Design a protein around this ligand. Structure first.
Ligand SMILES: CN(C)[C@@H]1C(O)=C(C(N)=O)C(=O)[C@@]2(O)C(O)=C3C(=O)c4c(cc5ccc(CN6CC(F)C6)cc5c4O)C[C@H]3C[C@@H]12
Ligand SMILES: [K+]
Ligand SMILES: [K+]
Ligand SMILES: [K+]
Ligand SMILES: [K+]
Ligand SMILES: [K+]
Ligand SMILES: [K+]
Ligand SMILES: [K+]
Ligand SMILES: [K+]
Ligand SMILES: [K+]
Ligand SMILES: [K+]
Ligand SMILES: [Mg+2]
Ligand SMILES: [Mg+2]
Ligand SMILES: [Mg+2]
Ligand SMILES: [Mg+2]
Ligand SMILES: [Mg+2]
Ligand SMILES: [Mg+2]
Ligand SMILES: [Mg+2]
Ligand SMILES: [Mg+2]
Ligand SMILES: [Mg+2]
Ligand SMILES: [Mg+2]
Ligand SMILES: [Mg+2]
Ligand SMILES: [Mg+2]
Ligand SMILES: [Mg+2]
Ligand SMILES: [Mg+2]
Ligand SMILES: [Mg+2]
Ligand SMILES: [Mg+2]
Ligand SMILES: [Mg+2]
Ligand SMILES: [Mg+2]
Ligand SMILES: [Mg+2]
Ligand SMILES: [Mg+2]
Ligand SMILES: [Mg+2]
Ligand SMILES: [Mg+2]
Ligand SMILES: [Mg+2]
Ligand SMILES: [Mg+2]
Ligand SMILES: [Mg+2]
Ligand SMILES: [Mg+2]
Ligand SMILES: [Mg+2]
Ligand SMILES: [Mg+2]
Ligand SMILES: [Mg+2]
Ligand SMILES: [Mg+2]
Ligand SMILES: [Mg+2]
Ligand SMILES: [Mg+2]
Lengths: 100, 206, 84, 98, 115, 127, 99, 12
RNA sequence: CCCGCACAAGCGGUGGAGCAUGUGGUUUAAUUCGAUGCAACGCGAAGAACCUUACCUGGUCUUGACAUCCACGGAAGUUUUCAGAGAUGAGAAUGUGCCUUCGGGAACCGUGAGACAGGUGCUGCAUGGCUGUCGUCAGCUCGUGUUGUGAAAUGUUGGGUUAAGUCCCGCAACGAGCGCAACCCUUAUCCUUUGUUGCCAGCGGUCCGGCCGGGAACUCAAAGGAGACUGCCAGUGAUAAACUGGAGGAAGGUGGGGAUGACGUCAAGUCAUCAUGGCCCUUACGACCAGGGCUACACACGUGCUACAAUGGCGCAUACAAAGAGAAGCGACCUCGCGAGAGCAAGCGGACCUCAUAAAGUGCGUCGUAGUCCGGAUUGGAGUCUGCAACUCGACUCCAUGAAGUCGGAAUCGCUAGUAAUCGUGGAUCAGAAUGCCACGGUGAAUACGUUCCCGGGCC
């Protein structure tokens, strides 16, 4: 992946962490059953003023070695390609070729 | 056709892992990434020190790294000054207490990684590929390898058309899972691009 | 559609722009990229120029449009037939 | 009761680690309900092996997590001392429950 | 026999027969019959004129037949007059609910028109 | 004083306890008729007893887990057969001849990469 | 290439078990069994001859060839014929084809 | 239609 | 002369319909790029609303979004306002630490300059690495010797035999290497060990629930062993290798399945995973943002799903799985809602808790061969949930609607057994978004005379 694309992900992770508590607060009001209509409305308006990149759903899992945005495996934090290279060198503990 | 990785297929049969730690999913990816960065750091720092293998254990919270080297003296340095520099950097990148152990490779000519790295060093110095390959094969067989194969692929001697050349002596029975095949690779970055080296060393069954 | 419990979505920047146009009685088209905003009753009689990807399409808001998204009135794809 | 759960990716290592625990208990003069082999988890991964296309070309990998339960009935005075003062082999996760 | 200006089949079970009305499906049919106090499996032929008159009263609580056809027509005309995206899809005779048109869409487009 | 046999078939495993009795069969605390609706399955369960002529000489107490109706009926037959050979070893050759001593080792074949099933390949267009 | 059935439950015949298998679709043997037995009961009552014997009557008239294959084709033709019929159920379609 | 549809299913 | 679901024998499909999906084409501001006979076309993509994103339109930046170096200002930061679609501008508050040699640095922010950074830009016909393919086909070679002026040959051919250059026998060859086989995983039988979170035969108790005391038997868990060798027997065979049959045995002749892919072939695929020679761009081919597009639709092709019904649909009742996942997670019970769901809130990093009704099945009833009580496309109305946000373009629910379709021309595909066919179940990716993919059990066939023919291949 381009250097810029890897830097966008770092920015998104950092903003999501910076605003996690505030976003959770606002969304708790918007979801709150016994919240007032005005308080719900104000929360809806406030939530959209926060940076879009503070939403966790903006993050794309990328291979931690290459930045590849497809073929990710969460267990390893790597794409399918880098998993295989690491696996065959014995660098992934316990992982071996499976037959059954 | 394409061949299975000789090391990979023998893991847990005749071949150990290079990382031995348990982790749950929560820490697994982070441990892999810290291991990657540790090996990246040490491989660069000890490029002149004939490192064959970097084994990583994670006892408790700490990290224990075993560096297999043909040259323990250069890695350790004077009164362990150099190995202490490594240990402090490894501790920082791992973010946990670090131990560094040194393991001597007594026979570098029987170590696939060191043989591969020896060939790629020579190719970058514009040694004739055929000479480098032939000597690698001759040395291994002299030091008691049951067999050795060396493959070199790319723009050999700066030719426009890339080709693969290989030499074998003795036995290299890659379908025998109990065969101790030491396999490793290296890349020479030449003026005409990448030449790839593969080395297989057979040291007997079981 | 958006859960009724959350209310209808409108972009805050558009809401404020609409409020100012209504209070002023200003009749110049409101330029917006907020295709996702719901049309509200107080937008009736305004011209909202809605982005379609390359131009702002003037949408004269009527009472029947209330509750629709603005993007519904600004088609994004150009098609005039294959055999033409 | 001390319950000890051991996990490892290799059964030889986990069996060494359980053998250490039982001997530590049976030296401290503690009753041990001997190693129970609990079900091995087999986590599987299927990956495409080509950099591009060739969808039918895959590798299938597995991590086996081995699991052992040891139960220490009537923990003596230095029983708990000898178990909490034990560095089992790297690669074995040890969870002690009271 | 005759309900909402249509003839309901006499030989069928009442629960099936009532679905002949445009605007009555299986759920509304069951609800109509539950309200009228008529069993689902009674044949329409086997009902008395008093029982049929109560069925007419229950059906009268729903918009059906020509009243429903005109509501649906009005709803589609409204979209087309608005000139919203859905209205444009109705005008052009293409899928209105986001379906692919590169292939398929034959229910809306009709049979294939050779180049 | 009872005679035991384990039986298995597909993913089923049956525990069969035999004693002298009057032809009672209990499977998982239910009668044979109640446990298996299928008469094929009832036949399979009763095959070894009918073959050795001990249908009302014996009471069977059976538990069975895993697999389906046919798997369980086959596991039970295998378990009964083994319990009968504990009861009387001389029955072996007759039970062996009927094919009941064999553990039917046929299992579901795994699905494979690039196939729809174990063997079913995706359709091929030549042109 | 270049280089056994079990008997049916109700009667004890490899011939009828094969017939059930030929009738069966989609591994639904219990369904097929119920059809074959329902059909044979209809067929037995009509003539007064037994199910198994009445089955042999129908086969002998249809059989076209090695003796095993003669039965196979006959059963395959009965089932194919019965499915082509336009009677209410398969059991009746089969009984009407056998009779 | 739509304005009273709107004002009854929602509120500030 | 041989082999392979290659044909034949069979069973079920595709080709017709609707829909899903990929591709071509056409269209477009853009419909990003790549894959192309088998071996591209549910392929890279294990999951495009925004993001992803590579494309378009417009708004913006220029040592830079991402590094190191130097200098000069600042602790970091946090709260907060206005303008703006946002990028980004202006502000306004507040805070003034940690190293202390109390010399100063270390962070970590700004700004200036330029060495540089940056490029999913080009070349897969400059490359590495990785992959497909012939093909898991039985081949491919070498040393030494010998033969030929020599290219070469022999071995490796031949007589038997095998799944196999498998093995035996013969033989100017004698040996060897890479392949075959074996060693590895899994499945079928048994034994030993351990016995909870799993187990319940016997026993005591019991509210009847392995529920309780207990028990360690059994199922099971998972470590270690045993077991299959053509070993035994017979007949055939060249006093052979082997073959055919039999016994015993859970298993019989490679028991079943997997992993494992020789020398090479196609300048095959991939410079867009990554790496990399060369070339090219550098106040732009780099970088930031909002909105759009990748979802377009006269059309053509490929792969699928759902059907066309009665071996079925519907209703009610009621059996029997396996494998797997789970902490920004799986979420019970209870209450509310027709429902999607909501509220409340246990338990569980799990043989314990949760996902989590298996469905086909079976019993009873009903429909009665109809475009139907078949089908479930399409469309209207009303909702739910995820998510800053579902207009373009989500999934799901409810009410209504109720299309084509009556078993599909030429042709063509898969499959030899727990297979095909059919029935559900789980997982990866993932906020949400499978008819795809990967995996799991349930039920469970037909047929194979044969090798003339068609396709691919082997040996002479
Ligand atoms: C895909 N198909 C169009 C062709 C194909 O099917 C084959 C095949 N063997 O079946 C190919 O070989 C192919 O895929 C392919 O790889 C090709 C090439 O690689 C190729 C070809 C021709 C070329 C001519 C010139 C050059 C030099 N470059 C262009 C100039 F600016 C510098 C390169 C070529 C090249 O790489 C033939 C194609 C055929 C393909
Ligand atoms: K569309
Ligand atoms: K290549
Ligand atoms: K020679
Ligand atoms: K978009
Ligand atoms: K599909
Ligand atoms: K019925
Ligand atoms: K219908
Ligand atoms: K959408
Ligand atoms: K068809
Ligand atoms: K998801
Ligand atoms: Mg890069
Ligand atoms: Mg995402
Ligand atoms: Mg688990
Ligand atoms: Mg109706
Ligand atoms: Mg409906
Ligand atoms: Mg769609
Ligand atoms: Mg199956
Ligand atoms: Mg054929
Ligand atoms: Mg079609
Ligand atoms: Mg394309
Ligand atoms: Mg190409
Ligand atoms: Mg390209
Ligand atoms: Mg080609
Ligand atoms: Mg596919
Ligand atoms: Mg986008
Ligand atoms: Mg603003
Ligand atoms: Mg470049
Ligand atoms: Mg190429
Ligand atoms: Mg040859
Ligand atoms: Mg050989
Ligand atoms: Mg092999
Ligand atoms: Mg090419
Ligand atoms: Mg390049
Ligand atoms: Mg964008
Ligand atoms: Mg697409
Ligand atoms: Mg229906
Ligand atoms: Mg589920
Ligand atoms: Mg029609
Ligand atoms: Mg019909
Ligand atoms: Mg076969
Ligand atoms: Mg399925
Ligand atoms: Mg041969």
């Amino acid at each position: 992946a381009k250097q810029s694309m890897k830097a966008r992900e770092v920015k998104r992770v950092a903003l999501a962490d910076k605003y996690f508590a505030k976003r959770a607060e606002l969304k708790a009001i918007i979801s709150d059953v016994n919240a007032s209509d005005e308080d719900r409305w104000n929360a809806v308006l406030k939530l959209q003023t926060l940076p879009r990149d503070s939403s966790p759903s903006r993050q794309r899992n990328r291979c931690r070695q290459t930045g590849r945005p497809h073929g990710f495996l969460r267990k390893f934090g790597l794409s399918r390609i880098k998993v295989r290279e690491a696996a065959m060198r014995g660098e992934i503990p316990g992982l071996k070729k499976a037959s059954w | 056709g394409q061949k299975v990785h000789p090391n990979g297929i023998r893991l847990g049969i005749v071949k150990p892992w290079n990382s031995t730690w348990f982790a749950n999913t929560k820490e697994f990816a982070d441990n892999l990434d810290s291991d990657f960065k540790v090996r990246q750091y040490l491989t660069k720092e000890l490029a002149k020190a004939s490192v064959s293998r970097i084994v990583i254990e994670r006892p408790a919270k700490s990290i224990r790294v075993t560096i297999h080297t043909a040259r323990p003296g250069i890695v350790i340095g004077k009164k362990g000054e150099d190995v202490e520099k490594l240990r402090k950097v490894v501790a920082d990148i791992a973010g946990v207490p670090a131990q560094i152990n040194i393991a001597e490779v007594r026979k570098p000519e029987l170590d696939a990684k060191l043989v591969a790295d020896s060939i790629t060093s020579q190719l970058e110095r514009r040694v004739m590929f055929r000479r480098a390959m032939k000597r690698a094969v001759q040395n291994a067989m002299r030091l008691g390898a049951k067999g050795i194969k060396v493959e070199v692929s790319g723009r050999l001697g700066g030719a426009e058309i890339a080709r693969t050349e290989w030499y074998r002596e003795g036995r290299v029975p890659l379908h025998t899972l109990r065969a101790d095949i030491d396999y490793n690779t290296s890349e020479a970055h030449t003026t005409y691009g990448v030449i790839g080296v593969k080395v297989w060393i057979f040291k007997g069954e079981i | 559609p958006r859960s009724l419990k959350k209310g209808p979505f409108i972009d805050l920047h558009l809401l404020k722009k609409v409020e100012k146009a209504v209070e002023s009685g200003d009749k110049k088209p409101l330029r917006t990229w907020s295709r996702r905003s719901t049309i509200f009753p107080n937008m009736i009689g305004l011209t909202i120029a809605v982005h379609n990807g390359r131009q702002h399409v003037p949408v004269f808001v009527t009472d029947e449009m209330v509750g629709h998204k603005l993007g519904e009135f600004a088609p994004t794809r150009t098609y005039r037939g294959h055999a033409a | 009761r001390i319950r000890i759960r051991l996990k490892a990716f290799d059964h030889r290592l986990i069996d060494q680690a359980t053998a250490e625990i039982v001997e530590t208990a049976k030296r401290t003069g503690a009753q041990v309900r001997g190693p129970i082999p609990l079900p091995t988890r087999k986590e599987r991964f299927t990956v495409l092996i080509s950099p591009h296309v060739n969808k039918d070309a895959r590798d299938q990998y597995e991590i086996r997590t081995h699991l052992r339960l040891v139960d220490i009935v009537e923990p003596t005075e230095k029983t708990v001392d000898a178990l909490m003062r034990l560095d089992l082999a790297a690669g074995v996760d040890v969870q002690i429950s009271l | 026999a005759r309900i909402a200006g249509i003839n309901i089949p006499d030989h069928k079970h009442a629960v099936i027969a009532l679905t002949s009305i445009y605007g009555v499906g299986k759920t509304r049919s069951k609800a109509i019959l539950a309200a009228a106090g008529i069993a689902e499996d009674v044949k329409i032929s086997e009902l008395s004129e008093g029982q049929i008159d109560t069925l007419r009263d229950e059906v009268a609580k729903f918009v059906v037949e020509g009243d429903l056809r005109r509501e649906i027509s009005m709803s589609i005309k409204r979209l087309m007059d608005l000139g919203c995206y859905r209205g444009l899809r109705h005008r052009r005779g293409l899928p209105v609910r986001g379906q692919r048109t590169k292939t398929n869409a034959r229910t809306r487009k009709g049979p294939r028109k050779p180049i | 004083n009872q005679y035991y046999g384990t039986g298995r078939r597909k993913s089923s495993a049956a525990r069969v306890f035999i004693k002298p009795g009057n032809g009672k069969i209990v499977i998982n605390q239910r009668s044979l008729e109640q446990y298996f609706g299928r008469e094929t399955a009832r036949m399979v369960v009763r095959q070894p007893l009918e073959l050795v002529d001990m249908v009302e000489k014996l009471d069977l107490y059976i538990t069975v887990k895993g697999g389906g109706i046919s798997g369980q009926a086959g596991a039970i037959r295998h378990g009964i057969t083994r319990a009968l050979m504990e009861y009387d070893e001389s029955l072996r050759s007759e039970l062996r001849k009927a094919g009941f001593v064999t553990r039917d080792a046929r299992q579901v074949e795994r699905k494979k990469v690039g196939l729809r099933k174990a063997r079913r390949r995706p359709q091929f267009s030549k042109r | 290439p270049r280089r056994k059935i079990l008997p049916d439950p109700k009667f004890g015949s490899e011939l009828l078990a094969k017939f059930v298998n030929i009738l069966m679709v989609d591994g639904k043997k219990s369904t097929a069994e119920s059809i074959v037995y329902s059909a044979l009961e209809t067929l037995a009552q009509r003539s007064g001859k037994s199910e198994l014997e009445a089955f042999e009557v129908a086969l002998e008239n249809v059989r076209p060839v090695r003796p095993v294959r003669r039965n196979a084709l006959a059963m395959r033709w009965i089932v194919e014929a019965a499915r082509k019929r336009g009677d209410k159920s398969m059991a009746l379609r089969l009984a009407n084809e056998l009779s | 239609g739509r304005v009273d549809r709107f004002n009854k299913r929602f509120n500030i």
